[PDB]
Every structure is written in C-alpha cells, then in structure tokens.
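Worked example 4.2. Below are the chains of a multi-component assembly; read each line carefully before continuing.
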Amino acid sequence: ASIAQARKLVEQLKMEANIDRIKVSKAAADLMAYCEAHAKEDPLLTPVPASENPFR
Amino acid sequence: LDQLRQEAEQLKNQIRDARKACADATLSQITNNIDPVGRIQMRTRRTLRGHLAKIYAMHWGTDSRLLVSASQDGKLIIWDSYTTNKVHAIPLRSSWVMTCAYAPSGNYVACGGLDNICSIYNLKTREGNVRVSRELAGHTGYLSCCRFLDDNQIVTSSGDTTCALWDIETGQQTTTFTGHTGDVMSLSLAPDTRLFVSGACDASAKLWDVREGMCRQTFTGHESDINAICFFPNGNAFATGSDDATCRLFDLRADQELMTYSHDNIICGITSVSFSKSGRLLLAGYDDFNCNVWDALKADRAGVLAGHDNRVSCLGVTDDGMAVATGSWDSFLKIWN
Amino acid sequence: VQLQESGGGLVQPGGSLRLSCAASGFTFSNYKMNWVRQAPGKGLEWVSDISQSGASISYTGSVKGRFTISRDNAKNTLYLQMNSLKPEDTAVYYCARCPAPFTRDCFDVTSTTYAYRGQGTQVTV
Amino acid sequence: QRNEEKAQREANKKIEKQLQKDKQVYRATHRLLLLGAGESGKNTIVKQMRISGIFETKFQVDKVNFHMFDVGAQRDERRKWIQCFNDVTAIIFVVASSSYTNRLQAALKLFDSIWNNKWLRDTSVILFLNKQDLLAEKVLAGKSKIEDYFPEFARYTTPEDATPEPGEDPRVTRAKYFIRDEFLRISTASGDGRHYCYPHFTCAVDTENIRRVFNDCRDIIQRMHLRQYELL
Amino acid sequence: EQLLFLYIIYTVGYALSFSALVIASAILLGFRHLHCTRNYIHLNLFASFILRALSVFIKDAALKWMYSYQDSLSCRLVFLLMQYCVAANYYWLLVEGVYLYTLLAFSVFSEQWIFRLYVSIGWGVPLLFVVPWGIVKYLYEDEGCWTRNSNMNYWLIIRLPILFAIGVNFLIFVRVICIVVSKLKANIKCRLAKSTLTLIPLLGTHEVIFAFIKLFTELSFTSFQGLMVAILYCFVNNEVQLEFRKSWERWRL
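Applying the procedure described above to all five chains together yields the following structure tokens:
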C-alpha cells in the first residue's frame, strides 16, 4: 500500500533525524592524525629497499 | 497520503539543515598545509596468465601471499603471487561468475553471479580435491558481492535491492536488510565487523548494523550509480565511485560528504576503489583503461598505473601493504609495487 | 537528484496547456531528458525526449505534430507544450532523466521503479 | 625445500596441462544471448530449439557448438547486468510485430538504447519480427490503424526487393515491410561497419530459426576475420 | 647495359626489402600484445625474406671476390643453400595463403598442433627436393659450381613445385576476392580495388600475371616485394599505429 510505504519512509527519516553528529573538522583531524601516525608503515607510500620487497 | 509526503520532505529539510550546521570547514581546508606525497611511479613486478575471458573480480588472502581470481570462462584459480604458480583450479557450475571472496581462515572461498546462488568451496578437504560444501540460495537477482566474517558467517548483496546475512552451517538466512530503491553493487565489512556499508544504483549509500538487521544512516551526494565502496582503514569513514566520473569520502560521524575527487579530462566512470594500508593514498579503476592514485588529503592526482589494454574491473591491496593487484577485461592480472 | 513537475490542470478537449519541469542537484547540460506518462489500467509508455543541447528531438507517433518539447539548460528546466488534446491525453506526466551523462543510450526510463523519475503532474481532459 | 618446490612444479604442470585442454573447448563454442519482450513469443522459440536467475540451452548446427542463455528471475533494470554480454557472438532480439500502450515504440527505444551502448558498439545484434501472422490478421480486418500510431504509414511505398510468399496481400506486405524499416532507420546511423543488424521475418514456430542464426554467426565471424586482415 | 641496369635495380631492391623486413620483424616481436598465430606466420615470412636476401647477396660477394674456389665443394654448397632459401620463401607465402583460406573456411582446428604442422610444411618440405637435386647434380654434373643447365630433367625437379605453390596461392586469391566482393555487394569500385591491391604482395600472385622488359618487371618488382609486405602488415596497420600512439603517450609521463 502507498500509505504503508509513505509511513515507513517517514519513520525512517525521523529515525535518521535523531542521530548523534560531530563537527566535520574533527573528522578531518582524525583522518589526518591516522594518516600521519602510520605514514612510515606503507611500502607503497615510500619504496622499500630491493632486499626487502619479495617482488624484486 | 499527501500529508505523509509533506512529513517526509520536512524531515529531509531538517536533515539537510543539520548536515549544513555540522558543516563548518572542508577537509581540504583542514589539510591545506600537509606536504604533497609526490609522484608515485609504480612499476609492474609480475603478470599472471591462464584466464581465458575477462577477470571480473579477485580477492586477496589474509597472509598477503595467496589470492583467488574469477573469470567469465567458468574458472577459479588460486595463484601464489610469489612464484606465480597455480595451486588450485575449480570448474564453476555457473560460468557467469561476478564476484569472489577468500575466507579469513584461508580454508574456504565463495563466489556468486547471475544464478542468484552463492557456493562455498573447501580448500582443505581430506582427499585434497576441492568440492562444493554448501549452497546458499534465497536471493531473487544476480549477486553483486559477498564477504566473510568468519568460517561460519557470510554477508551477501544482490540486484534485488536487499543485503542478506547467512549461517553457513544450516544454510538459512539470519537477517534481511532492505531500503534501497536501486541495485546494490558492492559492500565492505568494517575493520571490526560491527558495521557494513553498501552503495546502490540510486546515488545513496546506506550504513547498517550487522546484528540488529536495521539501517543506521544514509549518505547522498552522487549524481548517478555507485559501483565501488570500501572502508577507510581506521573504520571511521569510507569512499565510493560513481558513473559521474567522481570519487567521494563520507565520515560516519559527520553524516555528510568530506571531499570529492574529479578532473576535467576524466569523463568516464569508476569501477573499483581501494585504500592503502596507511590510508594516505587512494586508487581507483576507470573504464579508460587507467588506474589513478588520488592524494586523499589533497585531492590532487599523484600518479597513474598505466599498462592495461582494457577496462579495469577489479583491484585489491594486501593486509600488510606489500603488493597491489588488478584484473581487467584483457584477462591478465598485474602485481604493482 | 530532484525532479518536480508543475503547471498542470484541467482543460476541455482541443485546448492547450504548458508543463514546466524544475530540476536541481545535478548539472542539467550533461544529461539527456525525457517525458513519460502513465494512464489508468496501463503501464508506462514513452512520449518524447530531447538531446543535451536540443539539436535532436523525437516524438512518439501518436503525438507527432501536436505537442512540443523544449529545454532551457541555462534555467535547468524542461518544457512540454499541449495543443489539440484528445480524450486519451488524461494521464500523469513524469519528468525523467537518463542514468549516465555523456552517453547516447538511455536505459530503464520506463521502468516500474526508475530512481531519478519525478512524482509527475496530472492533466485531465 | 627442494622437494616442496618440485611438488609445486608438478602441481602447476598438471594444472597447466588441464587448462590447455580447457582452452581448446571454450574456443569451439559460441555464446548467444536471447533477449525478447515478455509477450514476444520468446519462450516458444526456446522450446523449439531445446526439442533460477538464468537458463542455459546448448545445441549444435553442423557440428558447431552453440551456447544460448535465457534471462529470468531478474528485475527489469537492465542497464547493469547487460554488460556481462559484451563478448557474445550476437544478441538475438525477438520482437512481435502485432505489438501496435503500444509495445512497438518501447521495443524501438530499447533497440536504439542497445545500439548506442558503448560496451556494445562491437557486439552484433540479430533482429526477429515474430508476430507476422498476427499483423496480417490485424491489417486484414481493418483493425490495423497503424497510421494513428505512425503519421507516416499510408505514404510509405513498398520496396522493389519484395519477394512475397504465396497468398500475400499487397497491403500486408507493405505493412510488414514498413515495420522493418523503422528499426533499420537506426541500424544504419552511426554503424561504421564495426557491428551490424540482421533484420528478418519469422513465425514463432518456424523451424528455420536455427539456420538463420547459424548463417548470421558465420557471416559475423567471416567479417571480423577479414577486418583483422584489413581486407575490409 | 641491360644486365648492368637489371643488377642495379634488383640489388637496391633487395637491400631495401631487407632493411624494411628487419625493422618490421623487430616491431612485431617487440610488443607482446600482438602475439598471435597470424603474427607468427608473418614473422616466419619475414625470416624467409631475410634469408633470401642474404643468399642473393652472398652470391654477388663470392662473384666479386673471385673476380676482384671454383673446384671446391663450398661453391656448390652455397648454390644449394640459395636454392633452398628460394624454395622455403615461396612455400612460406603459400603457408600465409593457406592459413587465410582455413580461417575463412570456418572450421575447427587444434591450435598448437596446426601451428607445428604449418612450421613443418614451411621450413621442412623444401628439403624434399633440394636434396634430390643436389645428389643428382653431384653424381652426374659435379662441376662449374653446379651452375650449368645441361639437362632439363634435373631442372624440372626444382622448377615444378614452385609452380604448384604459386598456382595454389592464385586460387586462394581468387576465392578470397570472390568472398570479399560478395560481402561488399550484400551491404564500391574503389573499395574493391584497394582490397585487391593489398592482397597481391602477401600471396605473391604476381608471378602468374607476368609469366628485357619481362626480366625488368620480374626482377625490379620482386626485389621490392619484401618492402611492401612490411609496410602493409607492419607499419600502416591500424593496430600497430595505435600501439605506437599508446606507447608514446605512456612514455610522455
């Protein structure tokens, strides 16, 4: 029924409306911090010596 | 019934206003001072041959050594990337395979496609011959993806607008996720397996709770379908690709888009996405036969892994971050370092 | 993505009326455009479409020479013009859009559950 | 480690000796997709050749392996699951001429959408028109009224190449040929010789339906080969 | 002066054909993408041209050195080698023709087995009459570097099979052109003319057409046949051009 679908849509929108949110700048800072912390633990980010990479 | 429409549109306006209120600064502005990563000129280091037709999906292994690939000639091949030697060959019943997965315990591999069915194979059979273990049925449309949680739980997405969770031991469904107006084309378990996000063919990506069988949020901002998705390594964000030739990043807490990757010369659609181990890079496959590495914190392109003669249809990265891999409709894989 | 029709109403046979489609959420120029309507007891049927710049047009045969299709990319709006309406014109008119930009093909527009298709507006004769 | 390496080499040798055998069978088989509207008599054709999300039918013409896949249990959103068939020999496309709200316009738009698709600018397409007798009945009784849904059917002139079957009413032949040219007005724009369209007329229970597709597959393969040599 | 001018013509012709063939073979072997049975047969043809050019240059070099060994067996062996090179080249042109005819015959075929059979019929078969000719000449006319033509009963052995192969190539040319004309008609003069010109160098049907001026045409053109085969199927080919464009675009990074 169209009424049932509309009611479900309204209920879902209401449920999503009551959602905790945080400042976007906080998310950007968190991502930057994570990227900086592991900046030295990704060979693709910085090539490793040929003795280490098994695909020499 | 109209009053329901007015209520829905008012709720949409409220959510949009809340998202705007939570929007004070952009990711680029916050990361406007970070150093550029420079030119990333990778180079092939292997090449695996043996697939007769186009490779449509591949998955890694938890040890970062083995991997499994699927082609539309009806074939699953498990390569040892170090020595490039075929370990197993499996003749599929349904030649139209559209996905594949590698169990975390390295004992099982699953696949599915236009037959609606998901099949489970056992790698460590007593006799050593790989045979079908359990067949999961219950969807009413091609299966667009699948992933493992453990040796007993498997989560699957389909072209019927519903994601389903299964108990492999019994073969019965345990949950059913619903709410997408379009086909779901991918999904990706969270690092801790608490949540999983799927993007569908309506420009909307929906975040779920794996236990309660309910929805949690809904992200929009794309102009067309969404073909790829993946969690950022920390689990607090994810990115996707759409046919509008753009890639975007959405933060779960922010409930809104953080940044968009686009360039004028790019007028084709993305088909795959993946992050690096450190989360400072972002790859993506285009139908122009070129991959591309986007600086996540700068949105500027940092390289290109040219070398495929046809559409890039899959991609992957090892857990340890040693070796990328890619398949393509040319029927060849390529390991990149 | 949003497609909201407006400008409908009631008109006696042989009259005239203009339909205005207001769109937002995407760059209008890059996308083809369509008009589709559904009548009681029948599934959706196609009517007309217009190219990106309007250089190419086409109509369903039964409507040829009666209506007119025009798009104002500068105002991201679409138009349909009504003249000499017969009794069979009673139906709702959906303002549609193709899935992918820059492409010549257009799939699924007349589908039962197309995603980028407005709610439609009613014209009665 | 030497023994393990030798065992791995032996396993790889066996796997490759099996894959070489497999490569010899996948090259001697043709993959054909069998499209067709719901009320197009599509299944009647399949029932003739034979005598879940996909139904597979295998047959052979003059010791040539054919692979025909029938779609089913899929939603009517085609623009994604259709790309899987960009590597097929030819996509059969059954239609009903008596379709003329009016399914014929829908078939026209769908065929145009297939034709102008990027992943399929190299996938040839066959064309059938499977409601010929129904069209003849609808035009004989005066119920055709094709002019109403097409402002240019009474001003059409029969082509000089008509080779009518016995007992064909000139009006019937003119109409049935008029239906064909509507689609061929599309299959001759932006063609560029990379892929082609093969119009035909056939009843739903015609035995020759296998022969026509066999011959068209032969022609497609020959044309592709000659285009590899730059002979065309 | 006629002999001098004929020499001047076909020496330069063979030199240019060899210079084009070396580059064509290098390009074909370079890109791994182009590896397919057709390109393997083409490469074998290129090798045959290279060997023929080398042999016809060694003949000139030996004549220059002796006129700047006659009684020795080495001269006879060199002559035999030249004859073998010629026969092998003609049969490899026949191989090209037969492969095209088989591909347009629309029949199933085992890839590896058929390729080995083609390699055998290409390089091996010429030994089945060259060796008989050599043994007969050694037994009965072992003198004058085997360059004399005392009896035609010994010349016919070499002569006939080449005529057979060229006739077969002419038949294949006829069939291919007939089918191309049918395809053109089913869906024109300039197109058929171009499609008929490009197919002569590969199949080498020119011999039947022609067989001072006669020598001029046969010598002048054939020395240039190698060059044209390289251009049509290595350089002007659309696949090779687009491969070059893509490779250059990649190297621009």
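Take a moment to check your reading of the output against the notes. Chain D has one domain: 32-226. The radius of gyration of chain D is 22 Å.
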